[PDB]
Design an enzyme around this catalytic site. Structure first.
Site, PDB file in Angstrom:
ATOM      1  N   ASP A  84      -3.676   2.283  -5.646  1.00  0.00           N
ATOM      2  CA  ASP A  84      -2.510   2.112  -4.757  1.00  0.00           C
ATOM      3  C   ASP A  84      -2.561   1.101  -3.837  1.00  0.00           C
ATOM      4  O   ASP A  84      -1.809   0.663  -2.855  1.00  0.00           O
ATOM      5  CB  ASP A  84      -2.319   3.366  -4.014  1.00  0.00           C
ATOM      6  N   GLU A  85      -3.361   0.035  -3.996  1.00  0.00           N
ATOM      7  CA  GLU A  85      -3.473  -1.097  -3.238  1.00  0.00           C
ATOM      8  C   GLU A  85      -3.223  -1.929  -4.116  1.00  0.00           C
ATOM      9  O   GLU A  85      -3.463  -2.118  -5.312  1.00  0.00           O
ATOM     10  CB  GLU A  85      -4.988  -1.308  -2.730  1.00  0.00           C
TER      11      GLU A  85
ATOM     12  N   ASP B 105       0.891  -1.224  -0.053  1.00  0.00           N
ATOM     13  CA  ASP B 105      -0.049  -0.112   0.036  1.00  0.00           C
ATOM     14  C   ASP B 105       0.968   1.267  -0.076  1.00  0.00           C
ATOM     15  O   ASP B 105       1.409   1.473   1.098  1.00  0.00           O
ATOM     16  CB  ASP B 105      -0.705  -0.085   1.214  1.00  0.00           C
TER      17      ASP B 105
HETATM   18  N1  LIG Z   1     -10.293  12.775  -4.448  1.00  0.00           N
HETATM   19  C1  LIG Z   1     -10.105  12.101  -3.178  1.00  0.00           C
HETATM   20  N2  LIG Z   1      -9.133  10.860  -3.013  1.00  0.00           N
HETATM   21  C2  LIG Z   1      -9.122  10.068  -2.065  1.00  0.00           C
HETATM   22  C3  LIG Z   1     -10.012  10.167  -0.763  1.00  0.00           C
HETATM   23  N3  LIG Z   1      -9.468   9.376   0.041  1.00  0.00           N
HETATM   24  C4  LIG Z   1      -8.425   8.640  -0.509  1.00  0.00           C
HETATM   25  N4  LIG Z   1      -8.393   9.066  -1.673  1.00  0.00           N
HETATM   26  C5  LIG Z   1      -7.172   8.685  -2.751  1.00  0.00           C
HETATM   27  C6  LIG Z   1      -5.781   9.377  -2.547  1.00  0.00           C
HETATM   28  C7  LIG Z   1      -4.961   8.454  -1.948  1.00  0.00           C
HETATM   29  O1  LIG Z   1      -3.561   8.958  -2.207  1.00  0.00           O
HETATM   30  C8  LIG Z   1      -5.545   7.233  -2.484  1.00  0.00           C
HETATM   31  C9  LIG Z   1      -4.747   5.917  -2.003  1.00  0.00           C
HETATM   32  O2  LIG Z   1      -4.527   6.000  -0.349  1.00  0.00           O
HETATM   33  P1  LIG Z   1      -5.673   6.266   0.708  1.00  0.00           P
HETATM   34  O3  LIG Z   1      -6.705   6.371  -0.234  1.00  0.00           O
HETATM   35  O4  LIG Z   1      -5.039   5.040   1.323  1.00  0.00           O
HETATM   36  O5  LIG Z   1      -4.773   7.525   1.237  1.00  0.00           O
HETATM   37  P2  LIG Z   1      -3.394   7.638   1.693  1.00  0.00           P
HETATM   38  O6  LIG Z   1      -2.452   7.678   0.418  1.00  0.00           O
HETATM   39  O7  LIG Z   1      -3.274   8.696   2.677  1.00  0.00           O
HETATM   40  O8  LIG Z   1      -3.375   6.107   2.423  1.00  0.00           O
HETATM   41  P3  LIG Z   1      -2.742   6.149   3.564  1.00  0.00           P
HETATM   42  O9  LIG Z   1      -3.643   6.731   4.758  1.00  0.00           O
HETATM   43  O10 LIG Z   1      -1.425   6.479   4.133  1.00  0.00           O
HETATM   44  O11 LIG Z   1      -2.677   4.341   4.091  1.00  0.00           O
HETATM   45  O12 LIG Z   1      -6.934   7.156  -2.451  1.00  0.00           O
HETATM   46  C10 LIG Z   1     -10.948  11.505  -0.806  1.00  0.00           C
HETATM   47  O13 LIG Z   1     -11.640  11.389   0.237  1.00  0.00           O
HETATM   48  N5  LIG Z   1     -11.066  12.102  -1.882  1.00  0.00           N
HETATM   49 CA   LIG Z   2      -2.392   4.371   0.791  1.00  0.00          CA
HETATM   50 CA   LIG Z   3      -5.165   2.300   0.736  1.00  0.00          CA
END
Ligand SMILES: Nc1nc2c(ncn2[C@H]2C[C@H](O)[C@@H](COP(=O)(O)OP(=O)(O)OP(=O)(O)O)O2)c(=O)[nH]1
Ligand SMILES: [Ca+2]
Ligand SMILES: [Ca+2]
Ligand SMILES: [Ca+2]
Length: 341
Positions: A105-106, A7
């Site tokens: 990203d998963e 991830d």
């Molecule tokens: N536009 C939009 N994209 C989102 C939202 N939540 C997540 N994403 C997208 C952007 C993130 O880089 C992507 C993949 O990782 P996550 O979803 O796990 O966010 P992040 O990278 O912070 O994951 P992490 O908390 O570090 O494990 O999903 C959202 O609320 N709005």
């Molecule tokens: Ca992530």
């Molecule tokens: Ca994730």
DNA sequence: GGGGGAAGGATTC
DNA sequence: CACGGAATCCTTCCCCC
């Protein structure tokens, strides 16, 4: 079985740092500006230097600049992230054939073959961690466990940028200790319906008569939790294939006038067909987010592919069907194409 | 009592 | 004040064995 889960950390924001290294160390916020006014929009995500202060995916940008007025605020760039992700996915194919790309990203790698034990799997993780970091300058968290759900839970526990192995031994202590809410697939809504039935831990799903449980959360999720409880959950790792494609834009002013919304609707259709990349859809759905953020949609399935003109003329009908059957003002409008030939 | 589709909505990541 | 994209389910409805 041995499923390894990868991830990418704070992905969008972390890609933004790769494409501009002078951003390392500073709080970074990837935004989605609606154009409804100065800094209107939301936070797609942010790196950890900003996550510690509360900034995070979902919250408005106006509510974010109040906490971190001097953070770097970048506009989202999907296209780019999509490419970088793909390059990284192709590096993973080098480690296995059985791979499931669950999202941008998963990814789950099936290594039941090329490994004997978790120590012979731990090293394999580092071989991948310290490989993507090198080839793509991107950091990731690896989760290792008997099956997908636990591989996933492992990752959640080791972030950011880490690696944790959850073996048969511990899995057992988690089916007891672990809070049901932190189990993949249990949002705030499902997490509540469960407290209401006294199921605060995975193991508690055995003390309830299935039927009473199949009525509260649907059968699919019932069998799901149970399988995990009786440690007999073992879904395979298949290659998921794109089923729908769409775009939902936000309007400058919440309206109800057909001629005022049509332009947005079309702009959404144009981009939708572009992304279709030579794929013909048999189904079209017109989705709309009302003024009170409730999501309403109307659609139609054709017995043949939908040409672009058809798309234009049919979306205007499905729209009127919404402005007719509904009375609330519309904030966001968009389309979705599915049932590809 | 089904199968089987379609349509509109829920919920999760 | 809160964008955006897609997947899996659920319930209801329908036609008709
Ligand atoms: N536009 C939009 N994209 C989102 C939202 N939540 C997540 N994403 C997208 C952007 C993130 O880089 C992507 C993949 O990782 P996550 O979803 O796990 O966010 P992040 O990278 O912070 O994951 P992490 O908390 O570090 O494990 O999903 C959202 O609320 N709005
Ligand atoms: Ca992530
Ligand atoms: Ca994730
Ligand atoms: Ca959760």
């Amino acid at each position: 079985m041995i499923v390894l889960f990868v991830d990418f950390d704070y992905f969008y924001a972390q890609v933004e740092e790769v494409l501009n290294p002078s951003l390392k160390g500073k709080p970074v916020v990837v935004c989605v500006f609606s154009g409804r006014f100065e800094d209107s929009g939301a936070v797609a995500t942010a790196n950890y230097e900003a996550r510690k202060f509360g900034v995070k995916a979902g919250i408005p940008i106006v509510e974010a600049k109040k906490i971190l007025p001097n953070a770097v605020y970048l506009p989202m760039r999907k296209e780019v992230y999509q490419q970088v992700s793909s390059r990284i996915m192709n590096l993973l194919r080098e480690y296995s054939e059985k791979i499931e790309i669950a999202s941008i990203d998963e990814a789950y790698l099936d290594i039941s073959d090329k490994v004997r034990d978790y120590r012979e799997a731990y090293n394999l993780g580092l071989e991948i961690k310290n490989k993507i970091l090198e080839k793509e300058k991107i950091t990731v968290t690896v989760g290792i466990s008997k099956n997908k759900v636990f591989a996933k839970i492992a990752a959640d526990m080791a972030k950011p940028n880490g690696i944790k192995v959850i073996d048969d031994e511990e899995v057992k202590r988690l089916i007891r200790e672990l809070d049901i809410a932190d189990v993949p697939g249990i949002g705030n809504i499902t997490a509540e319906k469960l407290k209401k039935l006294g199921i605060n831990k995975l193991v508690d799903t055995l003390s309830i008569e299935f039927d009473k449980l199949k009525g509260m959360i649907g059968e699919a999720k019932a069998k799901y939790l149970i399988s995990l409880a009786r440690d007999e959950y073992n879904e395979p790792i298949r290659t998921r294939v794109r089923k729908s494609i769409g775009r939902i834009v936000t309007m400058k002013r919440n309206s109800r006038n057909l001629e005022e919304i049509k332009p947005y609707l079309f702009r959404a259709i144009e981009e939708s067909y572009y992304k279709l990349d030579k794929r013909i859809p048999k189904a079209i759905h017109v989705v709309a987010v009302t003024e009170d953020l409730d999501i309403v949609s109307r659609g139609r399935t054709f017995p043949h592919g939908i040409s672009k003109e058809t798309a234009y003329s049919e979306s205007v009908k499905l729209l009127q069907k919404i402005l007719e059957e509904d009375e609330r003002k519309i904030r966001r409008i968009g389309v979705r194409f599915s049932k590809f030939i």
